[PDB]
C-alpha cells in the first residue's frame, strides 16, 4: 500500500510511466483538486538529488514539491502532461525543425543554468526530458537527477597549493585535462539534437562491423544524407561542435547558444509567450 | 582553554609538535596514569578520518583511542615516542641501509593492508610515519589520514552497465587507465625510501634549471653517484621500480615485499620480536 502521510495529502490514480527502479503515478493533491506527478523510487541517494532540486531554480528544470521517505521513496511534482521526449523521436519518427529548436534552446538554457551553478546533470537523454503539455509548441524540463554531482574545490587543487615532493606523475599530468567534467553534458545534448533532427541514433551497432566503442571515440556519426537533405547546414553544423570528441575543444552551451542555428527571434518570441503563459503572478507595483 | 569532557579524563602536558592547521600535545590518562599523544585539530573531515581508523586493525597503522569534538577537534592516540620519520631524515642525515629495510618493510605492509581494505592514503611522507621508540629498531605506525580515500563501486562501473548511445567518448577512454589510484601510494614510497637510504630528495629545485614538475613527469631522479655507493644495488633496484611514471607499470606493494631487497629473513625477525615485545596478551588455552 501507500504510506499514511502521502495518502493523507493526495489521492492516488493510474500509472503515466513505469520501468527501471521506478514508476510515476498521476495523483491529485486534495488540498487543491489539482493533478501532480509522483515520482515511485524503490529503495547519489534520492535524498541528496532532492536537495540539489530544492536549490535550483529555473523554468525548464523540474521542482520538488513533496518528498515522502517511507518503505519507498515517493516525490511529488508538477505534472508535465505532454510526458517524456523520449515517444516524440521513437520509431524513427522526428520533430520539425522548428520544434527541435525551441525544445533544444530551452534543454541549452537548463544545462548552461546547471553549469552556472557547479552541477553536471551526465545522464541527458530524451527520457529525461519532459514536455509541459501535448502540443508540438511546449515548456519542456529536464528531470532525473540520480547520477548528477556538484562541482567544487577538487583534491587536485588541494594537493596544487602544497610542493609536490612526494606528488606521483599522473596527477601532475591529470592537470592538463581537469575541470572540463561538464563537456559530458554537451556531447549528450549533441546526440539529442541528432535524434531530435534526424530520427535516428547517430552512434548505433544497427548495420556496422565497428563497435560502439570505436564509433564513439573516433567521433564517426553515422551520416545518412537523404534523411538529413531536409535538415538546414546550419542545424548540422552545431551538432557537428557539440559532437567535438577533445572534450576542451567541444562547444560550451554559451557557444552553443550563441550559434547562428539559435539566432531566431521567431523561436525565442514563442519561447517567451509559453513562459509567461505558464505563469501565475501576484499584483505588482507599477 | 581545554574543553571540559577531555580535561575529565586526560591531564594535558607539553607540545610534541606543531605547525599546519594543528598540534599534537602528551598527555596523562587519568585512569591508568599512563602518557597518551592528543592530536589537535582546528575547525574530507575528521569525523570520516575517524571512522575510517575505528575500522582498521594493523600494527603499523594508528588506532584511535578517544576523539572530542568541540570548538576544536580532539584526538588521542597510544604515544609513538620516537617522534616522527621526518626528523631522522632531515639536514642529509641517513639511515643505516638494515634500519631502511625495517622501517620501510613496515611501511609497506601498511599500506598493502590499507589497499586490501579499499583505503588510498595519499600522504604517504616522512611527517606521517611515526617511531614507537626513540631506538633505531622500533616499530613504526603511519598517521594522518586527512587526505584518504575509500575505494569502491564508481561511477564509471555504473555508467558502463548500460547502453553508451549518450556516452561521451573520453569517459570511454578513462576505462584503459581506471582504477590505479592506489598507485600514487607506491610512488610516494619510493620517494620516501630514496629519501631514507641517500638522505636526500630525488626531485627538487636545488641546483637544477629543470622544474620540478618536469622532473617528476619525465622520472628523472637526481642520482648522486658517490651519495649512492655505499648502498645496495638491491635497495637501488626497488626504488627504480617505485618511480616508475606509467602508473599500471609501477610496483604495488605486493611485488616490492617479493622483491630481493626484501628477503631478509634477519630483518623479519627483529620485525616480529619487537611485535610480540609491544604486545600485551591475555592467557591462551593450549
Ligand atoms: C527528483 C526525482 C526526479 C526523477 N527521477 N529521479 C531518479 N530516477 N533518480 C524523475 C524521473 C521521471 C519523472 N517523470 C515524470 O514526471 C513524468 C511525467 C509523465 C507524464 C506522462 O504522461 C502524461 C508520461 C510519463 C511521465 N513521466 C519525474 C521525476
Ligand atoms: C586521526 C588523526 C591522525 C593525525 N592527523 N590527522 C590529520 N591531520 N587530519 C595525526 C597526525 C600526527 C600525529 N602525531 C603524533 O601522534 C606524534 C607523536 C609525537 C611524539 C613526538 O615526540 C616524542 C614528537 C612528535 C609527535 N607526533 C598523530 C595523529
Redesign the interface.
Known amino acids: 500500500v501507500y504510506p499514511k502521510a502521502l495518502r493523507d495529502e493526495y489521492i492516488m490514480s493510474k500509472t503515466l510511466g513505469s520501468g527501471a527502479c521506478g514508476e510515476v503515478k498521476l495523483a491529485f493533491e486534495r488540498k487543491t483538486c489539482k493533478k501532480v506527478a509522483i515520482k515511485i523510487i524503490s529503495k547519489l541517494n534520492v535524498e541528496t538529488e532532492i536537495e540539489i532540486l530544492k536549490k535550483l531554480n529555473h523554468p525548464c528544470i523540474i521542482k520538488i514539491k513533496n518528498f515522502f521517505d517511507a518503505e519507498d521513496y515517493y516525490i511529488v511534482l508538477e505534472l508535465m502532461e505532454g510526458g517524456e521526449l523520449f515517444d516524440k523521436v521513437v520509431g524513427n519518427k522526428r520533430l520539425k525543425e522548428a520544434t527541435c529548436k525551441l525544445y533544444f534552446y530551452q534543454m541549452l538554457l537548463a544545462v548552461q543554468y546547471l553549469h552556472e551553478n557547479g552541477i553536471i546533470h551526465?545522464?541527458?537523454?530524451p527520457e529525461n526530458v519532459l514536455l509541459s503539455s501535448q502540443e508540438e509548441d511546449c515548456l519542456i524540463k529536464i528531470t532525473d537527477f540520480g547520477?548528477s554531482?556538484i562541482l567544487g574545490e577538487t583534491?587536485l587543487m588541494?594537493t596544487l597549493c602544497g610542493?609536490?615532493?612526494?606528488?606521483?606523475?599522473?596527477?601532475?599530468?591529470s592537470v592538463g585535462t581537469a575541470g572540463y567534467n561538464r563537456?559530458?553534458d554537451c556531447?549528450?545534448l549533441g546526440?539529442?539534437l541528432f535524434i531530435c533532427l534526424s530520427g535516428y541514433?547517430p552512434?548505433?551497432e544497427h548495420r556496422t562491423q565497428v563497435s560502439?566503442?570505436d564509433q564513439?571515440?573516433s567521433?564517426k556519426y553515422n551520416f545518412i544524407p537523404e534523411v538529413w537533405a531536409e535538415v538546414s547546414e546550419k542545424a548540422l553544423d552545431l551538432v557537428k561542435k557539440l559532437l567535438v570528441?577533445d572534450?576542451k575543444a567541444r562547444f560550451t552551451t554559451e557557444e552553443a547558444l550563441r550559434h547562428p542555428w539559435l539566432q531566431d527571434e521567431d523561436m525565442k518570441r514563442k519561447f517567451q509567450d509559453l513562459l509567461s503563459e505558464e505563469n501565475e503572478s501576484t499584483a505588482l507595483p507599477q
Chains 1, 2 share one sequence.
Do not use: C, M, N
Not at 122 to 125: G, I
Not at 163 to 173: G, I, R
Open positions: 551526465r545522464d541527458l537523454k547520477h554531482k583534491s588541494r610542493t609536490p615532493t612526494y606528488l606521483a606523475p599522473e596527477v601532475l599530468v563537456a559530458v556531447w549528450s546526440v539529442i541514433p552512434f548505433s560502439l566503442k564513439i571515440t567521433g570528441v572534450p
